[PDB]
Write a protein that binds this DNA or RNA. Structure first.
Ligand code: FES
Ligand code: K
Ligand code: K
Ligand code: K
Ligand code: K
Ligand code: K
Ligand code: K
Ligand code: MG
Ligand code: MG
Ligand code: MG
Ligand code: MG
Ligand code: MG
Ligand code: MG
Ligand code: MG
Ligand code: MG
Ligand code: MG
Ligand code: MG
Ligand code: MG
Ligand code: MG
Ligand code: MG
Ligand code: MG
Ligand code: MG
Ligand code: MG
Ligand code: MG
Ligand code: MG
Ligand code: MG
Ligand code: MG
Ligand code: MG
Ligand code: MG
Ligand code: MG
Lengths: 72, 108, 65, 113, 170, 50
RNA sequence: ACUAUGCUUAGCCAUAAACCUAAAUAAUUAAUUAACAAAACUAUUUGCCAGAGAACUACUAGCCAUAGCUUAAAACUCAAAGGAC
RNA sequence: AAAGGUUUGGUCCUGGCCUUAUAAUUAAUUAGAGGUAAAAUUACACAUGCAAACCUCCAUAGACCGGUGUAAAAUCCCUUAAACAUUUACUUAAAAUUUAAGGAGAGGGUAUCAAGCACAUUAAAAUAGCUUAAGACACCUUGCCUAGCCACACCCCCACGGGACUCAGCAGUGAUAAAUAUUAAGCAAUAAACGAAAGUUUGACUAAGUUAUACCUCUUAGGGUUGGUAAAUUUCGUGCCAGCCACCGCGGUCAUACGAU
């Protein structure tokens, strides 16, 4: 078979790689902010749980782990 | 698929029927906003008479005006219907001749 | 499943512990393991409070009697 | 001595768990007809059963009797009998211990032990 | 082509050919059979061909099947009284097994016929109403009775429009 | 009628139990003969191997 | 001409036309040529597919991955695209 | 489905789209009478009238009929117990009609909603359990089970309370929408309420009014179409313009495809 369908994907992937290259710095700031919102949503979801259970403060010796930050 | 696989999945999942320009309604009433000409995509050649309208739903759409010659102007009221104009891309509505401000084509 | 008596001797002699397969598979990732840890902790705290309340309630009743 | 309301007056199932005190979680299966294919498949249900003596082990077939009054929200049956013990089956036809499709004790013999 | 082996087993006519209707005492039928062997061939065919027919006629009976748990195949019925009926099906054809269980724990033809007649007691041919429940919706359908005004216009003297006019005239 | 049918069933199970013991008895005789011959071959091979 | 790199010691990344483009298992070779390729074909079980493009994309979650990988749409456009000859 | 049209220079295969059949609403043009059925933009706001009384005072009824489809995966089918704001009987039993607790099985969508976070058992009060890829939880959508059933009754899920303060009863109005029934008569029939009863009341209902939305019986003829699929075009005008097509497509001077005839 011909490679025509592969050529379409070849151009799509090439053009996408250069688009990511152009806006690489913008994408980095988008991600750090999407992860920060991802963390706040995680923290709030944990606060909802204990408040609904009837606790007025989080369980003793508990600190929500920061799981989306540059910990590794 | 095997009979066990057909049982676990059942009948084919059916994508919902998304609505069209009229929102699944026979006709809509709109007020003309502008009258302009649209060019039929190649290989056709004409100066097709179209108009923009604000429909009762609140959105704005481009409507082809059929017939040889229309008297439509801004602020006029028209009854739009479905039916795409094949040569005109994006024009999914048509005006009904003989209703509200739009009138029947004057016979020659 | 076939010879339980032979099974028991073999595990004891060979020193092999047999754990039964868990009915349900549990997914694991940082977000789940952290939420599942708090939920267990929250429950324990709620139950500890109830035990304290029951003791205080019973103690007051005993004094009245 | 009125009997239970529940339809399942007698249910057979496998003991899939025994981590609750004096209770055995049992999985029963029934055959349900697929209307499109007209073939029977297994619909399984979970039944909590009162195991008074904690004499049940995971994997054994058991018979449950519907309790007249529900003991709790989910415990509405008791353990009538253990049809097959896991790894300790006794052939109903001959009465001799078996280990799969074989006799641990020959039916010709009469050990009486 | 219908999938699977013996696709006739997945037809409503085949499922309705079953003749074993258990007595109300029967609650469970556990089937112990072996997948390999020579003396258990009839039991394997009974699970393959007959169990669907039995379940179809006894929807409320729990049929649970266990494989390779004992040296020989057998059937054990659990009754509501608490009795347990053990049947030995080794060296027995699938047809023989069906006939055996029909005799000991199967309803007789007379009993089944009586139930069918009782079920239809409240259907009356003379009753009028919707097609789902009755033969005729209205007496206009009956021959000789006054026909429906929609199909056939009524005489003027039988109409309220005409009668009301006369009362005003009087 | 139920009691009569439950009595006929128990008889059928005993009748088939009798056949099982008769069939399995024949197997023990034949299989015993084969076992003795197989043990003889082991004795011959075992001595040769030693 | 010369560097990253190909090498070694640990750790990471998890992608290939990773394709023999042919899932695994047990058969059968007559009652059997869409084309081409590596003859046809039955049963069992799981996975996957449902016009083309948009799209190895957007968003979501997971990940030692931070110009990344896996997961994976819709609007909108067309009356075809595609395979073999 | 008894199928058809349309990928290409051409063939086969695959594959989508579309055509032909049937029905509802609205619209264009057109239309005699008669009978019948149905009546339907909107849980947005409502002027006016009416829709529940009866009856020797007590009671009974206004909890129904009628209306709408708000909320909700809401349910169906089945089991058990219990009453009843009841009836008819008996001093003790047959029904109708409900309520509560349940469960053999069945029951919408999204898995890019994959975990839920107390959702369990025991009964010395301990154990660490419960649901979940055989789809839990979450979110979204929808009345269904149709001799009929379910929910709702101005709003705040409820209705002590509070509020933006009542036609989703009949008729009618404003606004809104493509969507257009009488601000009508009668209690004679049947149904319901009351009375011991003669009887009384009822916008339930009955007999009419309105309307080609449907069917039936009739008498006038109008609407569309005429390149292929797909039944059927003469002349003239136009000349890639004006226009046409459901799909394929047509129109550049002899156009059966546009407009008139
Ligand atoms: S349906 Fe019987 S009179 Fe009309
Ligand atoms: K053209
Ligand atoms: K290759
Ligand atoms: K086709
Ligand atoms: K409400
Ligand atoms: K009346
Ligand atoms: K005509
Ligand atoms: Mg080549
Ligand atoms: Mg491209
Ligand atoms: Mg170098
Ligand atoms: Mg390297
Ligand atoms: Mg890959
Ligand atoms: Mg390779
Ligand atoms: Mg890639
Ligand atoms: Mg990507
Ligand atoms: Mg992404
Ligand atoms: Mg092609
Ligand atoms: Mg109209
Ligand atoms: Mg009603
Ligand atoms: Mg709603
Ligand atoms: Mg997404
Ligand atoms: Mg209102
Ligand atoms: Mg309310
Ligand atoms: Mg009204
Ligand atoms: Mg009101
Ligand atoms: Mg209308
Ligand atoms: Mg009375
Ligand atoms: Mg010409
Ligand atoms: Mg045409
Ligand atoms: Mg023409």
């Amino acid at each position: 078979k011909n490679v025509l369908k592969i050529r379409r994907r070849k151009m799509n992937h090439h053009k996408y790689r250069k688009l990511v290259k152009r806006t690489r710095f913008l994408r980095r700031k988008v991600r750090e902010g999407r992860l920060k919102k991802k963390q706040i949503k995680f923290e709030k979801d944990l606060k909802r749980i204990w408040l609904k259970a009837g606790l007025k403060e989080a369980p003793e010796n508990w600190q929500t782990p920061k799981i989306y930050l540059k910990n590794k | 698929a095997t009979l066990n696989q057909m049982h676990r999945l059942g009948p084919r999942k059916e994508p919902p029927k998304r609505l069209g320009p009229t929102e699944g309604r026979p006709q809509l009433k709109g007020v003309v906003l502008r009258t302009f000409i649209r060019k039929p995509k190649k290989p056709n050649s004409a100066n097709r008479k179209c108009c923009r309208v604000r429909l009762s739903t609140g959105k704005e759409a481009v409507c082809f005006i059929p017939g040889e010659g229309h008297t439509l102007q801004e602020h006029h009221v028209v009854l739009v219907e479905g039916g795409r104009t094949q040569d005109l891309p994006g024009v999914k509505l048509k005006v009904v001749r003989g209703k509200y401000d739009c009138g029947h084509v004057q016979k020659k | 499943q076939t010879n339980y008596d032979v099974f028991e001797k073999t595990c004891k002699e060979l020193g092999v512990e047999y754990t039964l397969p868990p009915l349900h598979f549990q997914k694991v990732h940082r977000r789940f393991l952290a939420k599942k840890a708090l939920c267990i902790r929250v429950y324990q705290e709620v139950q500890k409070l109830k035990k304290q309340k029951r003791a205080l309630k019973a103690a007051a009743a005993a004094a009245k009697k | 001595i009125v009997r239970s309301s529940v339809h399942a007056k007698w249910v057979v199932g496998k003991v899939i768990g025994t981590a609750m005190i004096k209770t055995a979680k049992v999985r029963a299966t029934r055959l349900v007809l697929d209307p499109y294919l007209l073939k029977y498949f297994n619909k399984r249900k979970t039944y909590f059963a009162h195991d008074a003596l904690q004499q049940c082990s995971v994997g054994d077939i058991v018979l449950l009797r519907a309790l007249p009054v529900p003991r709790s929200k989910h415990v509405k049956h008791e353990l009538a009998e253990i049809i097959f013990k896991v790894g300790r089956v006794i052939d109903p036809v001959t009465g001799k211990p078996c280990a799969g499709t074989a006799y641990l004790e020959s039916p010709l013999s009469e050990p009486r032990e | 082509p219908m999938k699977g082996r013996f696709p006739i087993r997945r037809t409503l006519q085949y499922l309705g050919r079953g003749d074993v209707v258990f007595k109300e005492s029967v609650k469970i039928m556990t089937v112990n059979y072996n997948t390999y062997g020579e003396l258990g061939e009839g039991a394997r065919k009974f699970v393959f061909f007959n169990i669907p027919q039995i379940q179809y006629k006894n929807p409320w009976v729990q049929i649970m099947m266990f494989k390779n748990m004992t040296p020989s195949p057998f059937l054990r019925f659990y009754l509501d009284s608490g009795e347990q009926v053990l049947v030995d099906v080794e060296t027995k054809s699938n047809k023989e097994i069906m006939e055996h269980i029909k005799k000991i724990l199967g309803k007789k033809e007379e009993t089944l016929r009586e139930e069918e007649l009782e079920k239809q007691q409240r259907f009356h041919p003379g009753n009028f109403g919707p097609r789902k429940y009755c033969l005729r919706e209205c007496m206009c359908e009956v021959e000789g009775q006054v026909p429906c005004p929609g199909l056939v216009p009524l005489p003027k003297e039988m109409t309220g429009k005409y009668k009301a006019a006369l009362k005003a005239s009087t | 009628e139920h009691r009569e049918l439950m009595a006929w069933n128990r008889d059928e199970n005993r009748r088939m139990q009798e056949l099982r013991i008769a069939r399995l008895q024949l197997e023990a005789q034949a299989q015993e003969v084969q076992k003795a011959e197989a043990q003889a071959q082991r004795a011959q091979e075992e001595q040769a191997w030693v």
